[PDB]
Amino acid sequence: ELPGVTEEALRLKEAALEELAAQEVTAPLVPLAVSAFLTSRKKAAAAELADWMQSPEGQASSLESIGRSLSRRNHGRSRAVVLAHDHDEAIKGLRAVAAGKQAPNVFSVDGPVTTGPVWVLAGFGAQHRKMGKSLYLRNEVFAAWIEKVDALVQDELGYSVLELILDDAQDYGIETTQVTIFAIQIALGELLRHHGAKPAAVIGQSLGEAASAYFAGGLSLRDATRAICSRSHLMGEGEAMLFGEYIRLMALVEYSADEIREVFSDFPDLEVCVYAAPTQTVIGGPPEQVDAILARAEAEGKFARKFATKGASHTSQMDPLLGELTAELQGIKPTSPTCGIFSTVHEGRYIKPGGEPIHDVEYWKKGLRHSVYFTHGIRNAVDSGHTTFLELAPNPVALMQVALTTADAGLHDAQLIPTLARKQDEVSSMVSTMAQLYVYGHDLDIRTLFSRASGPQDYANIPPTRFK
Ligand SMILES: OC[C@H]1O[C@@](CO)(O[C@H]2O[C@H](CO)[C@@H](O)[C@H](O)[C@H]2O)[C@@H](O)[C@@H]1O
Ligand SMILES: OC[C@H]1O[C@@](CO)(O[C@H]2O[C@H](CO)[C@@H](O)[C@H](O)[C@H]2O)[C@@H](O)[C@@H]1O
Ligand SMILES: OC[C@H]1O[C@@](CO)(O[C@H]2O[C@H](CO)[C@@H](O)[C@H](O)[C@H]2O)[C@@H](O)[C@@H]1O
Numbered sequence: 001e002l003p004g005v006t007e008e009a010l011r012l013k014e015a016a017l018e019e020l021a022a023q024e025v026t027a028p029l030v031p032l033a034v035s036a037f038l039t040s041r042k043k044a045a046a047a048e049l050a051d052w053m054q055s056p057e058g059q060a061s062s063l064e065s066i067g068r069s070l071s072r073r074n075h076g077r078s079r080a081v082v083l084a085h086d087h088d089e090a091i092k093g094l095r096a097v098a099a100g101k102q103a104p105n106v107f108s109v110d111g112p113v114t115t116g117p118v119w120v121l122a123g124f125g126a127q128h129r130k131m132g133k134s135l136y137l138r139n140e141v142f143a144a145w146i147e148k149v150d151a152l153v154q155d156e157l158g159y160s161v162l163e164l165i166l167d168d169a170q171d172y173g174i175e176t177t178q179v180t181i182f183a184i185q186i187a188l189g190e191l192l193r194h195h196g197a198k199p200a201a202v203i204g205q206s207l208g209e210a211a212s213a214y215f216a217g218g219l220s221l222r223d224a225t226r227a228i229c230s231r232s233h234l235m236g237e238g239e240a241m242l243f244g245e246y247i248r249l250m251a252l253v254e255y256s257a258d259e260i261r262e263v264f265s266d267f268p269d270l271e272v273c274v275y276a277a278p279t280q281t282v283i284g285g286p287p288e289q290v291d292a293i294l295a296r297a298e299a300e301g302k303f304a305r306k307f308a309t310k311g312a313s314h315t316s317q318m319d320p321l322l323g324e325l326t327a328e329l330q331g332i333k334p335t336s337p338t339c340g341i342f343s344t345v346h347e348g349r350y351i352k353p354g355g356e357p358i359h360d361v362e363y364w365k366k367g368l369r370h371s372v373y374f375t376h377g378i379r380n381a382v383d384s385g386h387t388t389f390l391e392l393a394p395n396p397v398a399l400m401q402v403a404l405t406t407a408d409a410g411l412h413d414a415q416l417i418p419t420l421a422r423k424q425d426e427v428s429s430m431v432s433t434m435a436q437l438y439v440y441g442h443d444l445d446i447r448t449l450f451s452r453a454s455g456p457q458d459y460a461n462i463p464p465t466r467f468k
Contacts, residue, residue: 003154005147005162012166013137020137027085029428030063031435033446034097035076039110042078047098049462050091057461059087066090066460068450073464075446080108081435112441113415116200117388118342118381119189119215121208122374122398123181124274125307127172128422131394132165132184135426141194145187152222153179156229174309175236178207181394182228185211186221188392188419191430196445197437201340201350201386203377205398206274206313207232209345209367217338218359227364230328234321235368239311248312249290252282254302267293273314274372277404278379284312318369325365334359348376350384374398378405388415388440390433395422415440 005013034049036042052058053066063084082093083105096103135142150162161180164170172180185208189199204212210228213219219227242248255263256279257272264270267289274282280303283293290306297304311317334357341351343358345367351358378389382405389406391399396418406414417436420429437444459465 002151004151006154006160009150009160009162009166012163016133016137016166026425028064029083029085029425029431030067030090031431031438031446031449032063032067032082032084032090032094033070033073033075033079033438034082034094035073035079037076037078039078039100042076042080042108043098043100046080046094050094050098052462053087053091053094061460062457063087063090064450065458066462068453068458069460069462069465071447071450075438077111077441078109079112079439079441080106081439082106083432083435107436107439109439113388115385115387117197117390117415117417117437117442118201118203118386119199119212120203120205120389120391120393120398120402121185121212121215122205122391123178123185123207123393124205124397126393126395126397127177127181128394129171130168131180131420131422132187132426133168135420135430136162136165138427139191139430142187142191145190146183148221149183149186149225152225153183153229156225157233173236174239174311175232178228178232178235181207182211182225184394184420185392186214186224188430189215192392192434192437195434195448197434197443199339199390201342201381203342203374203381204344205374206367206372208398209364211392212341213359215339216341218335218341218357219332220335223332223334223359226329226332227359230325231364231368234324234328235311235313235318238318238321239309242310245286247287247310248284248315248317249287250282250284250307250309250312251290251294251304252276252280252307253293253297253304254279255281255283255297257281263293263296266296271312271315272371273312275375277375277401278408280401280404282307282314284315284317313368314371316369322365322369325368326361329361329364332359332361334363342377342381344373344377345370346373348373348378348380350380374401375405378402379409382406382409382411382414387411387413388417388442390417390419390437392419394420 034046080097084090093106096106097108153161161183202212202216210224214224270283270285273284294304389402399416420426438446
């Protein structure tokens with residue numbers, strides 16, 4: 001028997017709902033699907049739908065009912081979705097689809113993407129105060145998984161992540177950023193899975209590696225939760241006690257790996273934490289050297305940005321923690337993966353579905369202690385045919401690094417699909433995510449984006465639901 005939702009979480013949840021219940025209702029974002037075997041016919045269906053939506057009958061029908069009817073057609077090879085809040089946006093977006101023109105709320109392709117999507121599990125720097133709260137209050141499936149992770153983390157570390165999510169006065173530190181983003185990562189993917197989606201492959205980045213192992217079938221949710229919990233409290237306790245000459249900084253620099261090779265001969269104590277993009281690398285080390293390399297970068301007109309931490313993960317500074325990390329993970333059970341893994345721990349190499357288990361106790365030690373080969377994992381996915389990268393996160397920070405690598409690999413038509421984003425309506429965001437999965441032909445039951453009909457008013461008087 002796991003712990004239940006704490007009383008303080010229930011208390012905070014009630015305050016949040018009363019807050020929510022007294023706000024201005026925003027019009028929901030509705031996906032309108034249209035498709036055909038031929039792009040020409042798809043374009044004609046779009047203009048026909050927009051003609052009718054302009055008619056008095058179409059004006060009197062709700063977007064939700066129009067979208068539900070559309071959701072029930074046959075879904076052809078050439079597809080499009082218009083995301084819309086009202087009839088104008090819809091008609092406007094439909095006119096672009098008909099015209100073959102681009103629009104911010106419009107996705108349209110002549111045919112499906114050929115290979116499945118890669119789920120990107122990062123997190124590093126994606127966090128913000130209220131992340132995940134709105135979707136917890138408003139999506140029952142999301143909320144169920146958050147509470148499930150919240151119960152396991154209560155059991156591992158003795159506190160409630162849900163309390164952090166719901167209490168606006170509270171913010172995130174080295175430790176709680178990791179367990180909370182993890183919880184958000186788990187809940188976003190299960191939400192997606194609930195609507196019929198699934199990863200073709202996963203790739204992770206530091207904190208995200210735990211969730212990637214779960215979505216890859218490499219660890220039970222419990223053992224993935226043990227993996228993120230042990231690493232995160234050790235890191236937060238470790239860097240908390242760092243002062244003076246024990247301080248190691250972390251910074252992003254616009255230097256490639258080959259540049260870093262040359263540049264580090266002047267700085268004997270610097271190490272690579274993350275190969276993020278082909279020309280962006282996260283480095284760590286003593287403050288004097290970190291400051292010097294940044295100064296070298298600025299003078300060379302390159303980007304350099306210091307992070308907020310007195311300790312450097314993925315460096316030798318993690319050596320004191322590894323003994324305890326080992327003890328806390330005794331008992332985990334690695335399992336043969338059920339989708340592909342681009343392992344940025346193991347230098348970015350690919351592990352086939354059904355291969356040998358990788359998510360060993362040694363794997364989590366190596367992951368915390370050593371460099372993250374992110375751009376190599378991504379480059380490897382591109383070179384093996386993947387074009388869709390979907391990032392589960394409260395903010396799509398890693399998708400920026402992914403775009404750098406895909407363009408560098410020559411792939412300019414990449415499907416870069418975010419999930420949540422700060423100051424974007426969290427429900428609208430997920431609508432948009434699942435819309436995009438559909439338009440590109442990935443696994444997604446577009447019918448599940450609409451509540452079951454309880455009346456004829458739930459459909460619009462169009463095919464396939466015309467009224468006799
Ligand atoms: O939720 C808004 C409103 O609720 C109050 C109590 O009436 O505070 C609740 O919500 C805060 C935000 O999450 C919590 O920090 C607080 O603990 C909780 O009681 C008001 O103070 C606030 O304006
Ligand atoms: O250890 C000496 C060696 O390392 C340098 C590199 O810049 O400095 C570092 O080591 C010092 C300890 O001896 C620290 O005080 C300092 O913070 C660190 O950058 C040079 O002093 C020399 O080449
Ligand atoms: O073409 C089939 C393919 O399309 C997806 C979405 O990309 O599912 C759609 O088509 C199904 C009928 O074949 C519908 O059941 C579903 O509602 C619709 O989204 C994929 O999931 C499917 O493999």
